[PDB]
């Protein structure tokens, strides 16, 4: 359990792994993005580049698939989405290593979550903020990665939330190459699964019931090849809800709750899956990270607890 | 000699996957290796790693590239 | 109750505190140590008592210990803790606020007097100590009751009356603004942003204001019914709201005396003025209930602790727990932990259960280690690698042994010829049959009549014996007995002898073994040959049944079950022995009307149970894909499903699940940077997708690039050192000046053409040049090709 200091001057808001697992990018509240790499010799994380990205606190970053190159998204509270591509011929830890590409200003609200699409849908992207409007950005031109065109625009909430009331938004894509395109969208106390219809426009396909309070994290379990899909929900209650989605509007799909654990006694902040969807890591308000696995049954039981 | 990409009329991801190495699935832009029988790219490092251990094209088209790259 | 945090007084790391009891009677000075959580850090140094009923307090940052204390009667007792003067206004009334500036200006907030001004400011060095009344240097706010005031700078002061917010400077008698509002109580200044302050009202409606928004007038933020009431009724208020002293855009509020909510703010600029909004709310429960007021503690490494004073005046120290913000996983089963408080990031590498042991026992890192070791590329090699490993992987070795047998059968030309394929089929497909019946029967007899150097279904039982690998000769049976004995598994040799019926040979094999226990088992087995004519229900058969029940070895278990009673049905349902042996002893010794029922029962068991050894019965068929799908549902092993389903799916049947498994395993191999294993997997897929004709049914990548010459604009090679369509000269290598040749791969045989500058060198020449250089070697190119 060796710790490493990211060197930020403020809070760290989102940390994401890349596809290969040897790189992490750490956004923060001091408007900086620091990209760390794993040295194969020293076996320790070290900084690759640090640069000032936005004009407000950055709350969500996401790596793109390496078949599209080294692209890092960044959503922040200044209503901007900044896309960064790595220049191979540039000095380490200089600030000019990652070159700015686009600034999607189509959102009239402070954003919360940005999530790249899987590697079977294109170089798409998703955004959600305190405006109730879902925005999808496709990079339709492979020649230049700067003509990011908005293609879908679905409204999730009827009205934007109040200035003082707190609210959270999170996104999770479905990484199944052999299923219609789905998007798990969380807005306050609502979690909706969209689906790409035959007309090219997303429609409300299935709504996850429950969720008496704010939803802090949605993670779609990786489609390893099973006949059922899983969504992990970290609510503002103690509940780590796991939904069993079975698909059979191209195709109808049913939502069934698989498990509901009150084993944290507080707000569940982040819930996240493994590569194969076997280990579920849930972090809650008790200061402890609980791992979950399924043994001899479909219902998920608890495992090692890390404090 | 100028290297010319095949202008394939594509719609989705294969437009992006046309200019990708067949060993690492990364975009190739400098120091490539081109076969003649099969029209597939490789990086120079990817080619020098793969042909120390392999015998066919890494995309699995069935082309014996050590004997058919001319 | 008022706990006021004072800095710039201690040369050490300790932070001084000033406390007022909730009955508003005493003033107590503290020195709190941040590095120890226990209550012994709260050191009570001094106490000055009998101060009437205190209504306000302030401190002077310029000189240490100058602590002004107000009262309800009107006396502004200013003294030192670390002289003692008692001043008052010229008219005796209640003092409601107090502020001491850095330069020395001391303000005072009085009640509403028609013939007096409320906001009275003087300097300490310019006041006569022989008079009880004061000499106001600057006076404002006549006929008003000033309830809150604070010194923004060395000159200006921000005072709030019962109805107005005033920003009054001493350089000019005109205030900057006067905003009419009710939320004018307890102006608190943010220690990071000087242009932001927060008040509240009688209804508890707290509001964060911006001075530049009011100067020009809405509040920056509002919070309906956030804090306690009694502002316009009680002059003794518990401070149930404190600005954060550890990071910007944060504050903490106290609700119902038991829970503390830390509200973190977000800011966006519409383009200096930042429109605030609440991002996250963090709830912390106090150690003890009934708390009136609290205060922050600045800790090392951006930590937070809360010193709190109860309703009874007891002061304790409540730490803030380090709540994890993000717990992401990894492809390498590594856990990364981020906190809501500090900067550092926790990492749990893979190198109630232990964390590392659970991450090492997960199937992700098992699949990664197997893929690194080369699992599934050669079935005989993976049988060799699984057998030379002890963990206890039992069904995997048997199913890969069957896959090796079937691949050897296909590679020998057996059961791929004729008008029908019948490749990688199972026992169920052969047994159930399913264009003419006589034509398929005679070509299947021809399939039998290929290695020729009292049952009706003899043209199917022999095919099942060929498929399962149980058509071996008796001399080769003796050779197999010698092989199994040389491997050390004497019990498996005895089980195979019992299976093939030569019980005296089982006695001979188990006799003269390396163990005495095996010799005792051999004696028990030998006690059957002169005994099988007995009717039964005797003590020897009872002892044999007891030994079958108690013993741990499954081979000797089924040996005792067959010896005690001469029936095969106790052997065909034992799960601990391999299914290939059970199918051998089912095809060898069973009626067809019973063998069909056994096959149906075992197939219906292995389809739903997900057993990988059911592939002998079902084959690599759509029902085999159902078996592998149930296995993936039960185990989440897509690696084995991919390496099994690539043998027969795109050659015979197009199904979406196999494509999903193949794409998932390729993405996993790319995720672990096992590009070599992905390329070997792809070429193995292309090798195993070839039909009997030879047509490749796999999906390959389309053609990407081709070489032109810009003299006839055609391809230089057809799917010499000159172009084959216009005769123009090919470009030469920049090192050895040798041209391009057009007509086990050595490095010095192909050009490494850059796709940016279109300059080509031999690969050995390019490696030798670009190792010590980073520019294109051609005269006039600036392109870093490596
Ligand atoms: Zn490559
Ligand atoms: Zn090829
Ligand atoms: Zn080729
Ligand atoms: Zn030509
Ligand atoms: Zn050369
Ligand atoms: Zn060049
Ligand atoms: Zn070049």
UniProtKB/Swiss-Prot annotation, chain A:
Membrane topology: Peripheral membrane protein
Matching InterPro entries: Sec13/Seh1_fam, WD40/YVTN_repeat-like_dom_sf, WD40_repeat_dom_sf, WD40_rpt
Gene3D superfamilies reported for this sequence: YVTN repeat-like/Quinoprotein amine dehydrogenase
GO process terms (BP): cellular response to amino acid starvation; mRNA transport; nucleocytoplasmic transport; positive regulation of TORC1 signaling; protein transport; regulation of TORC1 signaling
A molecular function GO annotation: structural constituent of nuclear pore
UniProt keyword list: Membrane, mRNA transport, Nuclear pore complex, Nucleus, Phosphoprotein, Protein transport, Repeat, Translocation, Transport, Vacuole, WD repeat
GO cellular-component term (any): nuclear pore outer ring
WD repeat residue numbers: 7-46, 53-94, 106-147, 153-192, 210-248, 263-302
Keyword Transmembrane annotated: no
Additional information: Present with 952 molecules/cell in log phase SD medium.
Family: Belongs to the WD repeat SEC13 family.
Complexes and interactors: Component of the nuclear pore complex (NPC). NPC constitutes the exclusive means of nucleocytoplasmic transport. NPCs allow the passive diffusion of ions and small molecules and the active, nuclear transport receptor-mediated bidirectional transport of macromolecules such as proteins, RNAs, ribonucleoparticles (RNPs), and ribosomal subunits across the nuclear envelope. Due to its 8-fold rotational symmetry, all subunits are present with 8 copies or multiples thereof.
Protein name: Nucleoporin SEH1
Lineage: Eukaryota, Fungi, Dikarya, Ascomycota, Saccharomycotina
Gene responsible for this protein: SEH1
UniProtKB/Swiss-Prot annotation, chain B:
Subcellular location as annotated: Vacuole membrane
Protein purpose: Component of the SEA complex which coats the vacuolar membrane and is involved in intracellular trafficking, autophagy, response to nitrogen starvation, and amino acid biogenesis. May be involved in telomere capping.
Assembly and binders: Component of the SEA complex composed of at least IML1/SEA1, RTC1/SEA2, MTC5/SEA3, NPR2, NPR3, SEA4, SEC13 and SEH1.
Family to which the UniProt record says this protein belongs: Belongs to the WD repeat WDR59 family.
Misc note: Present with 556 molecules/cell in log phase SD medium.
Name the UniProt record assigns to this protein: Maintenance of telomere capping protein 5
Organism name: Saccharomyces cerevisiae (strain ATCC 204508 / S288c) (Baker's yeast)
Gene: MTC5
Span covered, complete protein: 1078 to 1147 of 1148
From Swiss-Prot, chain C:
CC annotations in GO: cytoplasm; Seh1-associated complex; vacuolar membrane
InterPro entries reported for this sequence: MIOS/Sea4 (IPR037593), MIOS_a-sol (IPR049092), WD40/YVTN_repeat-like_dom_sf (IPR015943), WD40_repeat_dom_sf (IPR036322), Zn_ribbon_mio (IPR031488)
UniProt topology in membrane: Peripheral membrane protein
WD repeat start and end residues: 49-82, 90-132, 178-216, 398-434
GO BP terms in the entry: positive regulation of TORC1 signaling; protein transport; regulation of TORC1 signaling
Any matching Pfam family: zinc_ribbon_16
Entry's localization field: Cytoplasm; Vacuole membrane
Gene3D superfamilies found in the cross-reference section: YVTN repeat-like/Quinoprotein amine dehydrogenase
Keywords: Cytoplasm, Membrane, Phosphoprotein, Protein transport, Repeat, Transport, Vacuole, WD repeat
Highest taxon listed in the record's lineage: Eukaryota
Similarity section: Belongs to the WD repeat mio family.
Miscellaneous field: Present with 184 molecules/cell in log phase SD medium.
Role this protein plays: Component of the SEA complex which coats the vacuolar membrane and is involved in intracellular trafficking, autophagy, response to nitrogen starvation, and amino acid biogenesis.
Assembly, per entry: Component of the SEA complex composed of at least IML1/SEA1, RTC1/SEA2, MTC5/SEA3, NPR2, NPR3, SEA4, SEC13 and SEH1.
Protein name in the entry: SEH-associated protein 4
């Amino acid at each position: 359990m060796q710790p490493f200091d990211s060197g930020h001057d403020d809070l760290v808001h989102d940390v994401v792994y890349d596809f290969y697992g040897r790189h992490v990018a750490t956004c923060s509240s001091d408007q900086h993005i620091k990209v760390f790499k794993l040295d194969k010799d020293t076996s320790n994380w070290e900084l690759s580049d640090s640069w000032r990205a936005h004009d407000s606190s950055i709350v969500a970053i996401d790596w793109a698939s390496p078949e599209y190159g080294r692209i890092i998204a960044s959503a922040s509270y200044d209503k901007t989405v900044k896309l960064w591509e790595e220049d191979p011929d540039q000095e380490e830890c200089s600030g000019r290593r990652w070159n700015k590409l686009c600034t999607l200003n189509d959102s009239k609200g402070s954003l919360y979550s940005v999530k790249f699409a899987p590697a079977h849908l294109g170089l798409k992207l998703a955004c959600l903020g305190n405006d109730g409007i879902l925005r999808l950005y496709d990079a339709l031109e492979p020649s230049d990665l700067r003509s990011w065109t908005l293609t879908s625009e679905m409204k999730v909430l009827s009205i934007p939330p109040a200035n003082h009331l707190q609210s959270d938004f999170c996104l999770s894509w479905c990484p199944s190459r052999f299923s219609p395109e789905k998007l798990a969208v969380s807005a306050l106390e609502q979690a909706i699964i969209y689906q790409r219809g035959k007309d090219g426009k997303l429609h409300v396909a299935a709504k996850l019931p429950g969720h008496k309070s704010l939803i802090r994290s949605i993670s779609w379990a990786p489609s390893i090849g099973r006949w059922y899909q899983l969504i992990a929900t970290g609510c503002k209650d103690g509940r780590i809800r796991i939904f069993k989605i079975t698909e059979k509007l191209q195709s109808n799909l049913q939502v069934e709750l698989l498990s509901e654990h009150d084993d944290h006694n507080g707000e569940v902040w982040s819930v996240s899956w493994n590569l194969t969807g076997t280990i579920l890591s849930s972090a809650g308000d008790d200061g402890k990270v609980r791992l979950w696995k399924a043994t001899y049954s479909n219902e998920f039981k608890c495992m090692s607890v890390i404090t | 000699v100028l290297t010319h990409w095949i202008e394939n009329n594509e719609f989705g991801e294969e437009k992006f996957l046309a200019r990708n190495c067949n060993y690492c699935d990364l975009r190739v832009t400098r120091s490539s290796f081109i076969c003649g029988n099969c029209q597939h790219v490789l990086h120079s490092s990817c080619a020098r790693i793969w042909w120390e251990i392999g015998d066919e094209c890494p995309s699995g088209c069935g082309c014996n590239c050590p004997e058919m790259f001319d | 109750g008022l706990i006021k945090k004072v800095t710039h007084w201690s040369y050490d790391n300790l932070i001084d505190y000033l406390s007022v009891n909730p009955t508003r009677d005493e003033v107590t000075h503290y020195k709190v140590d941040p590095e120890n959580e226990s209550d012994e850090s709260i050191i009570k140094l001094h106490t000055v008592k009998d101060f009437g009923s205190i209504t306000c307090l302030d401190y002077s940052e310029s000189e240490i210990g100058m602590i002004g204390v107000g009262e309800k009667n009107g006396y502004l007792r200013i003294f030192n803790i670390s002289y003692d003067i008692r001043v008052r206004a010229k008219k005796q009334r209640c003092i409601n606020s107090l502020g001491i500036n850095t330069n020395g200006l001391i303000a005072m907030g009085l009640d509403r007097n028609k013939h007096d001004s409320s906001l009275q400011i003087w300097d300490m060095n310019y006041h006569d100590d022989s008079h009880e009344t004061i000499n106001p240097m600057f006076s404002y706010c006549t006929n008003e009751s000033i309830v809150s005031l604070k010194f923004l700078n060395d000159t200006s002061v921000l005072a709030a009356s019962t109805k107005f917010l005033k920003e009054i400077d001493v350089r000019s008698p005109n205030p900057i603004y006067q905003h009419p509002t009710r939320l004018t109580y307890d102006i608190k200044l943010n220690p990071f942003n000087d242009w932001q302050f927060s008040t509240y009202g009688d209804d508890g409606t707290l509001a964060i204001w911006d001075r530049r928004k009011l100067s020009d007038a809405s509040p920056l933020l509002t919070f309906e019914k956030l804090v306690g009431s009694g502002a316009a009724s009680r002059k003794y208020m518990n401070s149930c709201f404190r600005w954060s002293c550890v990071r910007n855009n944060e504050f903490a509020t106290l609700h119902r005396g038991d829970t503390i909510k830390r509200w973190r703010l977000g800011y966006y600029c519409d383009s200096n003025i930042e429109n605030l909004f609440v991002s996250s709310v963090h709830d912390t429960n106090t150690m003890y209930d009934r708390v009136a007021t609290f205060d922050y503690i600045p800790r090392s490494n951006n930590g937070t602790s809360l010193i709190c004073m109860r309703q009874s005046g007891t002061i304790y120290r409540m730490p803030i727990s380090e709540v994890c913000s993000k717990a992401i996983l990894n492809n390498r089963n590594s856990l990364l932990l981020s906190n809501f408080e500090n900067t550092e990031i926790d990492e749990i590498r893979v190198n109630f259960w232990k964390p590392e042991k659970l991450l090492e026992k997960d199937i992700s890192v098992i699949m990664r280690t197997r893929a690194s070791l080369g699992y599934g590329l050669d079935p005989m090699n993976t049988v060799e690698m699984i057998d030379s490993s002890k963990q206890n992987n039992a069904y995997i070795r048997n199913t890969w042994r069957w896959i090796a047998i079937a691949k050897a059968s296909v590679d020998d030309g057996t059961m791929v010829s004729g008008d029908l394929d019948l490749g990688y089929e199972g026992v169920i497909g052969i047994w159930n049959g399913i264009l003419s019946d006589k034509q398929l029967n005679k070509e299947m007899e021809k399939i039998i009549k290929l290695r020729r150097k009292g049952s009706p279904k003899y043209v199917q039982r022999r095919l099942c014996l060929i498929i399962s690998g149980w058509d071996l000769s008796r001399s080769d049976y003796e050779d197999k007995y010698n092989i199994i004995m040389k491997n050390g598994h004497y019990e498996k040799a005895a089980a195979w002898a019992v299976f093939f019926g030569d019980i005296p040979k089982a006695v001979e094999i188990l006799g003269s073994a390396k163990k005495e226990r095996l010799r005792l088992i051999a004696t028990a087995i030998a006690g059957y040959l002169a005994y099988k004519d007995l009717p039964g229900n005797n003590a020897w058969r009872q002892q044999c049944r007891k030994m079958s029940s108690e013993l741990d070895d499954p081979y000797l278990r089924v040996i005792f079950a067959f010896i005690a009673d001469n029936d095969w049905w106790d052997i065909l349902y034992e799960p601990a022995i391999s299914l290939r042996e059970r199918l051998g002893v089912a095809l060898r010794f069973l009626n067809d009307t019973d063998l069909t029922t056994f096959l149906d029962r075992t197939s219906s068991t292995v389809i739903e149970n997900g057993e990988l050894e059911g592939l002998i019965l079902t084959g690599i068929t759509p029902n085999g894909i159902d078996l592998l799908q149930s296995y993936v549902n039960k185990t989440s092993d897509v690696q084995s499903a991919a390496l099994i389903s690539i043998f027969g799916s795109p050659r015979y049947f197009r199904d979406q699940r196999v494509d999903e498994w193949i794409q998932t395993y390729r993405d996993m191999l790319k995720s672990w940077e096992l590009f070599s294993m992905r390329a070997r997997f792809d070429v193995l897929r292309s090798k195993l997708s070839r039909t009997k004709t030879g047509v490749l049914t796999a999906d390959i990548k389309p053609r990407q690039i081709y070489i032109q010459c810009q003299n006839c604009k055609q391809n230089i090679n057809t799917p010499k050192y000159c172009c084959p369509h216009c005769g123009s000269s090919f470009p030469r290598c920049a090192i050895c000046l040798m041209p391009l040749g057009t007509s086990k791969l050595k490095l010095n045989e192909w050009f490494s053409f850059c796709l940016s500058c279109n300059h080509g060198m031999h690969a050995g020449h390019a490696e030798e040049w670009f190792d010590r250089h980073n520019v294109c070697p051609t005269p006039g190119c600036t392109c870093q090709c490596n």
